[PDB]
Amino acid sequence: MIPEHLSIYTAYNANIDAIVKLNQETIQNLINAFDPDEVKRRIEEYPREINEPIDFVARLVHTLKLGKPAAVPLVNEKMNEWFDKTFRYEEERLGGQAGIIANTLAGLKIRKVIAYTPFLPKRLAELFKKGVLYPVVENGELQFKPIQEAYREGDPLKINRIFEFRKGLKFKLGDETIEIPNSGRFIVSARFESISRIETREDIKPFLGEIGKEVDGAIFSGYQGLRTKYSDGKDANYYLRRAKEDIIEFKEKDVKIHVEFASVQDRKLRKKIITNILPFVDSVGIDEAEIAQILSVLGYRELADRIFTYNRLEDSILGGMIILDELNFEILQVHTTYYLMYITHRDNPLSEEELAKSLEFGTTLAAARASLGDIRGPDDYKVGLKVPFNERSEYVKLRFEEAKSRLRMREYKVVVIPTRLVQNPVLTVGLGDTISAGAFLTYLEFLKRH
Numbered sequence: 494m495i496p497e498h499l500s501i502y503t504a505y506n507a508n509i510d511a512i513v514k515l516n517q518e519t520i521q522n523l524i525n526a527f528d529p530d531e532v533k534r535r536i537e538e539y540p541r542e543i544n545e546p547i548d549f550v551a552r553l554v555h556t557l558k559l560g561k562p563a564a565v566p567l568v569n570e571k572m573n574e575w576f577d578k579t580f581r582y583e584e585e586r587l588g589g590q591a592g593i594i595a596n597t598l599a600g601l602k603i604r605k606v607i608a609y610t611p612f613l614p615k616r617l618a619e620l621f622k623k624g625v626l627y628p629v630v631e632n633g634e635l636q637f638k639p640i641q642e643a644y645r646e647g648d649p650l651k652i653n654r655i656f657e658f659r660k661g662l663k664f665k666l667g668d669e670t671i672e673i674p675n676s677g678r679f680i681v682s683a684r685f686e687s688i689s690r691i692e693t694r695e696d697i698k699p700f701l702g703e704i705g706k707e708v709d710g711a712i713f714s715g716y717q718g719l720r721t722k723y724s725d726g727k728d729a730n731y732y733l734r735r736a737k738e739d740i741i742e743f744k745e746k747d748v749k750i751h752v753e754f755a756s757v758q759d760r761k762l763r764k765k766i767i768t769n770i771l772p773f774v775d776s777v778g779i780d781e782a783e784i785a786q787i788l789s790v791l792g793y794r795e796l797a798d799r800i801f802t803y804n805r806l807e808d809s810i811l812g813g814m815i816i817l818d819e820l821n822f823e824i825l826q827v828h829t830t831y832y833l834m835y836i837t838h839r840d841n842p843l844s845e846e847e848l849a850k851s852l853e854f855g856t857t858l859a860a861a862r863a864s865l866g867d868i869r870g871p872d873d874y875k876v877g878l879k880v881p882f883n884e885r886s887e888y889v890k891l892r893f894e895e896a897k898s899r900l901r902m903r904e905y906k907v908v909v910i911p912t913r914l915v916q917n918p919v920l921t922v923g924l925g926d927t928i929s930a931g932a933f934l935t936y937l938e939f940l941k942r943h
Contacts, residue, residue, distance in 0.1 A: 494874070495601055495602075495603070495871045495874060496603070496934055496935060496937070496938035497601070497602060497603055497604060497871070498603075498604055499603050499604060499709045499710065499934060499937055499938060499941075500603065500604050500605035500606070500607075500707060500708045500709055501598055501603065501605075501606055501607075501708055501709065501710050501711065501712060501934070501937075502607045502608075502609070502704060502705075502707075502708045502710075502711040502712075502743070502748075503590075503591040503594045503595045503598070503606070503607075503608050503609070503711070503712045503713075503714075504591050504608070504609040504610065504693070504711070504713055504714075504715070504739075505591055505609060505610055505611065505691050505692070505693075505713065505714070505715040505718075506589035506590050506591050506592070506610065506691070506714055506715025506718060507587065507588070507589035507591050507592030507595070507608065507610040507613075507617060507621075507651075508587075508588050508589040508592065508617065508651035508652065508653060508683065508688075509585050509586070509587070509588065509616060509617055509620060509650075509651065509652040509653070510585070510586050510587070510588035510652075510653050510654075510655065510922070511582045511584070511585045511586075511652055511653070511654050511655070512582060512583045512584045512585075512654075512655045512656075512657060513580045513581070513582060513583060513654060513655070513656045513657065514583050514657050515557075515656050515657060515658045515659075515662070515679075516662065517662055517663070517664060519580070520557070520658075520662070520664045521664045521665070523550060523579065524550065524554065524664060524665070524666055526546075526550075527546075527547060527550055529666055529667035530667075531547065532547065532550055532551055532554065532666060533666070535547050535548065535550075535551035536551045536552075536554065536555045539555075540552055540565075541565070542565065542566045542567075542568045542684075543565055543566065543567045543568065543569070543572065543681060544568060544569050545569075545572075546572075546575055546579075548565075549565075549572075549681070552565050552679070553656065553679050554666060554671075556658075556677075556679045557658055557664075557671070557673050557679070558671050558673070559674075560658075560660070560673050560674030560675040560677060561675070561677065562677040562678050562679065562680075563679050563680070564679075564680040564681075564682060565679070565680070565681055565682070566681075566682050566684035567654075567681050567682060567683055567684055567685065568684055568685050569685055570649070570650075570685040570686075570687055570688075573650055573652060576652075576654060576681075580654075583657075585616070585620065586620060587617075587620040587621060588653060588922065588923070589610070589651075589715065590714035590715060590753050590755070590923065590926045591608060591609070591610060591712070591714055591715060592608070592610070592620070592621065593922075593923040593926050593927065594712050594714075594753075594926055594927075594929075594930045595608035595621065595622075595625045596621060596622045596625065596867075596868075597858070597862065597868050597926075597927050597930050597931075598930060598934070599621075599622045599623070599624040599625045600622060600867065600868030600869055600870065600871075600873065601858075601868060601871050601874065601934075602624070602870060602871050603934070605626065605707065605708070606624060606625050606626065607625070607626040607627065607628060607637060607704065607707070607708065608621065608625050608626070608627060608640060609627065609628060609693065609697070611648075611690065611691070611692055611693070611694045612648045612649045612650070612651060612687075612688060613627065613640070613643060613644050613645055613648050614644055614645065614646070614647070614648045614649075614650050615644040615646070616650065617644070617648075617650070617651070618640055618641050618642070618643060618644035619641050619644075621640045621641060623639070623641070625639075625640045626638070626639065626640060627639075627640035627643040628697055628700065628704055629643050629697070630696045630697060630700070635697075635700040635703050635704065649687035649688050650688075651683045651688040652683055653680065653681065653682050653683055654680070654681040655678050655679075655680050655681075656678060656679040656680070656681070657676075657677075657678055658673055658676065658677055658678070658679065659673070659676045660673055660674060660675050660676050661673065686720065686723060686724060688718070689718050689719060689720045689723070690723070690727075690732070691715050691716065691718045691719050691732055691736075692732055692735045692736070693735065693739050698735075698738075698739075701739055701742035701743065702742045702743075702745060702746055704742075704743075705742055705743045705745070705746030705748050706746055708743075708748055709748065709749065709937050709941065710748060710749045710750070710751060710933060710934075710937045711743050711748050711749075711750050711751070712750075712751045712752075712753060712929070712930065712933060713736075713739075713740070713750060713751070713752050713753075713770075713774065714752065714753040714754075714755065714926075715755075716733075716736065716752075716755070716757075716766045716770060717755040717756065717757045717762075717766070719732050719733070719762060719766075721759065721761070721762060729762055729765050730765065730769075733765060733766070733769035733770070734769075736769060736770060737769060737770075737773065740770075740773050740774060744773075744775075749775045749776065749936075749937060749940070750774040750775050750776065751774065751775065751776035751777070751778065751929065751933040752770055752771065752774045752776070752777050752778070753778040753925075753926055753929050754777065754778060754779045754780075754783050754787075755783070756782065756783065756786065757786070760789070760790055763786060763787075763790055764790045767787060767790060767791070767820070771820045771822055772820045772821055772822060773822075774822050775822060775823040775824070776822070776823060776824050776825075776826065776933055776936060777820075777822050777824075777825050777826070778826045778828065778925070778926075778928075778929035778932070778933070779816075779825065779826070779827055779828070780827070780828050780829065780925055781800065781804060781809060781827065781828075781829045781830075782801075784797075784800055784809055784812050784813065784816065784827060785797040785798075785800040785801045785812070787816055788800070788812050788815065788816065791815070791816070791819060793812070793815060796808060796811065796812050796815075797812070800812055804829075805892075806832065806889065806892045806893060806896055806909070807892070807895075807896040807899060807900065809827060809829070809834070810834070810836075810896050810900055810907055810909075811900055813825050813827055813834065813836045813907075814836060814900075814905055814907075817836050817837075817838075817905065818904070823837070823838065823841070824836070824837045824838075824841060824936070825837075826852070826855075826928075826929060826932055826933075828855075828912075828925050828928045828929070829912070830912065830914065831883055831885045831889055831911060831912055831914065832889045832909050832910065832911055832912060833852040833855060833856055833909070833910055833912060833928065833932070834852075834907065834908065834909045834910075835848045835851070835852060835906070835907070835908040835932075836905055836906070836907050836908075837905065837906045838904065838905070838906075839903075839904055839905065839906060841906055842939075842940060842943040843936070843939050843940070843943065845906060845908055847939045848906065848908040849908050849910055850935065850939075851931075851932050851933075851935040851936045851939065852908065852910045852932055853910055854931045854932065854934070854935040855927075855928040855929065855930075855931035855932035855935075856877075856910070856912045856913045856928060856931075857874065857877035857878060857880075857913055857931070858874055858877060858927055858928070858930070858931035859877070859912075859913075859924045859925075859927045859928045859931065860876075860877040860880035860912075860913035860914075860915050861873055861874050861875070861876045861877030861880075862877075862920060862924070862927050863880075863915040863918035863919065863920055863921075863924055864876055864877070864879070864880060864915060864918065864919065865919065865920075866919040866920045867920075877913060880913040880914070880915055881913065882910075882911045882912070882913055882914075883911055883912055883913070883914035885911065886911035889909065889911050890911075893909045
């Protein structure tokens with residue numbers, strides 16, 4: 494069942510996600526450090542990014558009193574040390590699509606899992622599972638090390654911080670008492686320059702093809718971390734030309750490549766990624782929100798608006814077909830709350846049943862991880878079998894048949910299954926990534942058999 498003989502490389506995004514519990518002592522001690530009217534002044538002026546500590550407290554306490562969640566970018570690297578010296582973390586865990594994917598695969602105990610990120614400080618390296626390899630240059634040659642032991646002292650440190658606040662708590666901002674209405678999280682995302690240089694670094698770059706010889710597939714993600722423009726005159730395009738070069742090295746070695754897409758708010762960057770990356774890879778993983786974002790920049794604004802507004806199976810099948818037809822990679826996987834879907838060219842070697850089985854492995858693996866919070870060993874996949882296909886399945890199936898009646902299916906194989914939906918899971922972060930990892934893993938297994 495688990496295709497344990499396959500070897501997979503993942504890049505490029507891995508980071509620390511760190512959680513802080515805002516109890517009374519913690520929030521009051523923080524506020525106490527500042528001048529109260531200095532804080533008040535900063536709230537009304539409303540900082541939309543965090544450059545200095547007063548931006549942070551201001552945005553936070555505004556969020557705490559409203560009792561409504563918020564995410565705010567950290568755009569100054571030097572703040573890492575401030576956060577770390579001011580707060581204690583409940584938990585530090587691995588985040589970033591490549592990180593999560595690497596840890597899930599190493600939890601399945603496949604034959605080999607190599608992960609790469611250009612930024613590997615010790616603190617990040619130690620959050621990976623045992624078993625994940627990292628490529629390094631040693632004595633002028635390629636070697637792999639256990640990733641926990643491959644860290645570079647001084648590498649840039651990407652850390653996203655989730656502040657949990659629970660209802661009930663009161664604190665004071667000078668004389669003014671303040672009770673928190675609801676629970677929630679205040680999220681501070683790493684969005685400074687040093688962690689936005691998303692690439693294979695120059696030392697390892699010359700060995701990518703040698704790395705390629707060691708794997709059956711590579712899963713690439715994290716393009717969404719690129720910025721428009723960089724300090725040293727580099728730009729998104731510069732990094733995207735390097736990204737294309739990496740793709741070429743693996744595909745020349747007969748590696749199949751899967752790109753897991755992501756939300757890219759800047760439409761121009763989103764357009765550059767789609768243009769530069771998608772037509773050149775084999776497999777692509779998107780969610781329902783992403784399908785519309787892509788269509789929107791491809792010019793299909795009406796259909797994108799329909800998808801966003803009504804979330805119908807039919808409009809997603811049409812929109813997936815358009816994206817495949819326009820971009821001409823090999824297979825598209827769409828993940829949605831109630832159904833997963835594959836769209837392939839008519840000459841894809843897999844049968845409908847194998848395509849279904851691959852999707853089923855994906856939703857099963859994700860349901861497992863959503864229930865347990867972590868894949869420790871291959872038997873854990875079986876926990877996903879305990880999560881039934883959702884209550885909308887029969888309606889999904891009926892609507893799929895109606896959709897096939899309305900829409901053309903000449904040039905395309907379209908396969909739809911219902912998800913093993915977990916209502917309210919131990920782990921929310923990265924379920925889409927885990928679906929794609931399982932789907933792509935089994936897609937490789939079936940191709941290899943063919």
